[PDB]
């Protein structure tokens, strides 16, 4: 739920900064949604994980 099967997005790593400026490690996870990909318009759906960026760009077809 952090690596897209199409674009290979990865979770960015960073430091959460508090009011007292205490740096604590954390990650920025991609918005990766479960999608039923229809590779061929015939209509056999396969289950994959695709980032919300790839859905918007139309890289996966839900037919």
């Amino acid at each position: 739920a952090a690596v897209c099967d199409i674009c290979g997005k990865g979770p960015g790593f960073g430091k959460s900064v508090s009011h007292s400026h205490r740096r604590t490690s954390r990650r920025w996870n991609p918005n990766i949604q479960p999608v039923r990909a229809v590779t061929r318009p015939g209509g056999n759906k396969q289950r994959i994980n695709a980032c919300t960026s790839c859905i918007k760009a139309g890289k996966v077809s839900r037919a």
Partner: protein, 151 residues
């Protein structure tokens, strides 16, 4: 998300209209179900929309029509012209469901779509005469003889 309607959808428009709609609507309801196409290029989409609207209304079938189509499929053979080498007897290109459908419509008369013709089961990647089964309905089927003539 701008898309061109193919059929008529209530509260949205009629065929040929270009509408902008929420991307959730087009991706999950209209485009997958074939009720519209993406509005990307006027020369293509308008011509494609016209062809789609006529094709859907002209390829429809009912239970009574399926029985009538079953009898109408009793005509003679249908010939296919394909590019091939006469020395071997095997085809260069591959016969596609549109090629079979376009052959029957222009010669026989019945109007069918690619969705029903069973082609891979007959293994017609050769030269000769092969029988092709056509499923017009869940219970009703039909058989059409196919003769293939090489280039």
């Amino acid at each position: 998300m701008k898309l061109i309607l193919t059929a008529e959808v209530e509260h949205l428009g009629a065929a040929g209209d270009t509408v902008e709609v929420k991307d959730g609507y087009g991706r999950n309801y209209l485009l997958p179900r074939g009720l519209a196409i993406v509005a990307s290029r006027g020369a293509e989409r308008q011509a494609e929309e016209i062809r789609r609207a006529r094709e859907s209304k002209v390829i429809r079938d009912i239970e009574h029509a399926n029985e009538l189509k079953t009898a109408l499929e009793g005509l003679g053979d249908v010939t296919l012209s394909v590019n091939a080498a006469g020395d071997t007897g095997k085809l260069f290109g591959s016969v596609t469901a549109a090629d079979v459908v376009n052959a029957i419509k222009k010669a026989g008369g019945p109007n069918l779509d690619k969705r029903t013709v069973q082609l891979a089961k007959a293994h017609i990647k050769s030269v000769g005469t092969h029988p092709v089964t056509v499923k017009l309905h869940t219970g009703v089927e039909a058989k059409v003889s196919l003769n293939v003539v090489a280039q």
